[PDB]
Amino acid sequence: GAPPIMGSSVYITVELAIAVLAILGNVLVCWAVWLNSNLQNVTNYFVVSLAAADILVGVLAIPFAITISTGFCAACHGCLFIACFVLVLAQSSIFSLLAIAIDRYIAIAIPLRYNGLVTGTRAAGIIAICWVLSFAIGLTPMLGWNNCGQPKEGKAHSQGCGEGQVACLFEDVVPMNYMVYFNFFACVLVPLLLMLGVYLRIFAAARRQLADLEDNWETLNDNLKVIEKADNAAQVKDALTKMRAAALDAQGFDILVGQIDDALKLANEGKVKEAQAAAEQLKTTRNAYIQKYLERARSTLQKEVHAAKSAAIIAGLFALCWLPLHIINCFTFFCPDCSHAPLWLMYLAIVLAHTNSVVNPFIYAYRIREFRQTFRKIIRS
Amino acid sequence: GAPPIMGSSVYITVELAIAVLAILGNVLVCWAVWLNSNLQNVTNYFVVSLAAADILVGVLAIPFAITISTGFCAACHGCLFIACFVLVLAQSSIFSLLAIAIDRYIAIAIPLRYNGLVTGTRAAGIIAICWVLSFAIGLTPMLGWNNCGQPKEGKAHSQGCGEGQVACLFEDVVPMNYMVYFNFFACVLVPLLLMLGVYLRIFAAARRQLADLEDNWETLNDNLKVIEKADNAAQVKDALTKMRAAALDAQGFDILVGQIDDALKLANEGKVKEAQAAAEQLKTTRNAYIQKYLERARSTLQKEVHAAKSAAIIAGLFALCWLPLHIINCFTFFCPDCSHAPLWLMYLAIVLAHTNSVVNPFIYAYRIREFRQTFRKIIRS
Ligand SMILES: CC(C)CCC[C@@H](C)[C@H]1CC[C@H]2[C@@H]3CC=C4C[C@@H](O)CC[C@]4(C)[C@H]3CC[C@]12C
Ligand SMILES: CC(C)CCC[C@@H](C)[C@H]1CC[C@H]2[C@@H]3CC=C4C[C@@H](O)CC[C@]4(C)[C@H]3CC[C@]12C
Ligand SMILES: N#Cc1c(N)nc(SCc2ncc[nH]2)c(C#N)c1-c1ccccc1
Ligand SMILES: N#Cc1c(N)nc(SCc2ncc[nH]2)c(C#N)c1-c1ccccc1
Numbered sequence A, B: 001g002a003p004p005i006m007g008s009s010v011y012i013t014v015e016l017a018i019a020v021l022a023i024l025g026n027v028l029v030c031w032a033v034w035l036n037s038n039l040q041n042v043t044n045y046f047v048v049s050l051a052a053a054d055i056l057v058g059v060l061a062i063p064f065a066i067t068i069s070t071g072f073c074a075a076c077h078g079c080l081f082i083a084c085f086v087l088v089l090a091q092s093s094i095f096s097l098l099a100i101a102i103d104r105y106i107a108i109a110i111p112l113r114y115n116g117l118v119t120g121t122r123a124a125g126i127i128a129i130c131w132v133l134s135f136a137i138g139l140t141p142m143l144g145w146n147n148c149g150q151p152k153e154g155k156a157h158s159q160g161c162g163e164g165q166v167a168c169l170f171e172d173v174v175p176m177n178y179m180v181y182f183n184f185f186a187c188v189l190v191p192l193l194l195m196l197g198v199y200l201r202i203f204a205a206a207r208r209q210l211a212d213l214e215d216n217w218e219t220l221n222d223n224l225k226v227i228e229k230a231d232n233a234a235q236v237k238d239a240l241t242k243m244r245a246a247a248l249d250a251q252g253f254d255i256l257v258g259q260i261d262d263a264l265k266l267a268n269e270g271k272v273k274e275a276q277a278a279a280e281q282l283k284t285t286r287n288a289y290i291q292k293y294l295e296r297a298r299s300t301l302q303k304e305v306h307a308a309k310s311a312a313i314i315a316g317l318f319a320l321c322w323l324p325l326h327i328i329n330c331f332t333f334f335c336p337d338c339s340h341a342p343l344w345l346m347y348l349a350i351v352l353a354h355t356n357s358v359v360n361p362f363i364y365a366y367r368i369r370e371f372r373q374t375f376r377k378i379i380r381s
């Protein structure tokens, strides 16, 4: 049984190292968005809300975690504030991650109405609502769902606490049924599962749109071959009618549709050879115009998929960092006779959850050019 | 390719956290030995030499590691000093660990001559020799075994280095054949293997001595039973002669040997019943005296085994922390075409080796009462 200040010196130093990084990296995220007008869009306002939560993890949650780990004497409700504040930040993070996923789904599924649906001032209103909701969720124990009515009086007397005070220990004041059913299952697990569903729908929408672009491109080229190897005017007409509906479906295009109409008129006059010659002109338009549109549309979809993968990595890292702590609480709660969860593992799980506040600035720097470039310029300046 | 200052900010913060802990813990080790005269013995003078090396890891090696990781412009030999200084500390640690193992072997194998062989002033002389040898081993590259004759001129010109300067990078100035054959195989691996051999001999010596104590105890009790179930004076004499040689072998004992002689005289006179009655008196002496010696001797051996296990854990942790770095160097050296050792893994291996400077104060606190108690009193004061 080595002096408690030794093992806790490792814990405290690790916590403070994480706080330094959480503050530095996320201040840099906010700074980049403030300076670069190319980074000022709705998606990045939620990115700023998420970085603000991570800055408060370093400034407030980590000092609070170090404090409550001592078990210092405190009035139960004051204790309950420094125990639960991290839950407010985690909840705010969940709401920002969920909003980012929904923003990306609107952008890929209905890009025509994105600008009119997703407004900068509406994003600020959603963020405000989400922060107020997060306070209500994270601080629900202070509203009455707590163990303040059944204080551990033996622990309070041992530590020489005053009347009306308890030894401030997280597990003594925050109910385990709140942590597992309310915080984990309802407020963390359900939103993360919803996020997963949204990301699946984003990638499936992108996969289908790319297939539809290639399907229309193939239909155009295949029907040109059908016209070349046709012997009757009815066969030329059949392929041209299918090409015309496909050209409007994919909507340079004025020349294309006009040239299809020119050949269709010749086909209807029974001039097969003349219709096939008119259809050959379509190849020049396809090369000079249509292929450029196809390649630009494909490149736009790939950029959207790349941005959605970056956002999903951010969400995936939140799940990876927070799940161990939640899972440990599930074992403590659901298996009361399980000899499990040593204190070193509980501190490792807490340290891992705090680590999530360090990782997002790295993901933006490694995956997003505009962020990476702005970070270089801020470090230079 | 995120800005280099970001990933290196994680590395630097982790290195500085380790330096804080290496200094704090090992200052506490030195403080305890200085204050408590129960901790002032030869074994703990080597413990202080090992803690002094760990304090210099925090004060000098870690700031040097951070510095050379930038690749700053430097005169090749100056570069070679801040590259190799950590090797001096690692070598000094190896010598202290080896001395601690040899000290414990002398204590268990020849406890009668330990005080006369192992002197405090001789320990200070060995430590002095070991530190001078460590400087020669660790700084052998500065004596000429270096890549200063073949500077990477393209790297020096790129960084705008002056004439006579190189980009200070460990792998550019310290030869890989020095690191693998000389530093690893000869100066690290051979001494660690020697340490393992010494620890095996310590535990085998302890195991044999405990078996010899129980063998003499069993021989005493079994021969008492032989005397009780004897019918002739020759049988009583045979068991008493074996008991007498065993009593001197285990050397209260004056009473025991005298009572054996009393019964032996009766046996030689052909007085069987009288000899068996005289031998029954041995039981009172065995209970009042001999069993107390047996239990104290057994308890002393168990304390020595416990102390040797603690010292072996210290050595085992050095091997566990330093081996990954050495093994990575072996892959780089022996397999030049092996696409291996990413830079994040090289930093993880360096961070793990530095971590070894933090762990020893914890092992003493968790395993050694006199250290643990002194640490409490230093923290109280
Ligand atoms: C994607 C979702 C479903 C993953 C979230 C993790 C949850 C639902 C799972 C994963 C492992 C599960 C635990 C596995 C082991 C036990 C021990 C048993 O005595 C009580 C239930 C308990 C404690 C389970 C509770 C629920 C649990 C924590
Ligand atoms: C107890 C002692 C023997 C353990 C010390 C580790 C040393 C001797 C061993 C363990 C794993 C070994 C390495 C395993 C793989 C390779 C790849 C091969 O292409 C070159 C040799 C090399 C690089 C070996 C060199 C020696 C090595 C590093
Ligand atoms: N779940 C849980 C939990 C806990 N069971 N304990 C503590 S603090 C005392 C402690 N740390 C290690 C051992 N004992 C904390 C804190 N902060 C938490 C916690 C909860 C949510 C978010 C972040 C952390
Ligand atoms: N072996 C090796 C080694 C190395 N190959 N490089 C570096 S420093 C640049 C670096 N760190 C990460 C990537 N690149 C260092 C240092 N210090 C060492 C080293 C050697 C002995 C002891 C402790 C560390």
Ligand code: NA
Pocket (backbone or CB within 6 Å): A050, A053, A054, A089, A090, A093, A356, A357
């Ligand atoms: Na967060």
Ligand code: NA
Pocket (backbone or CB within 6 Å): B050, B053, B054, B089, B090, B093, B356, B357
């Ligand atoms: Na060391």
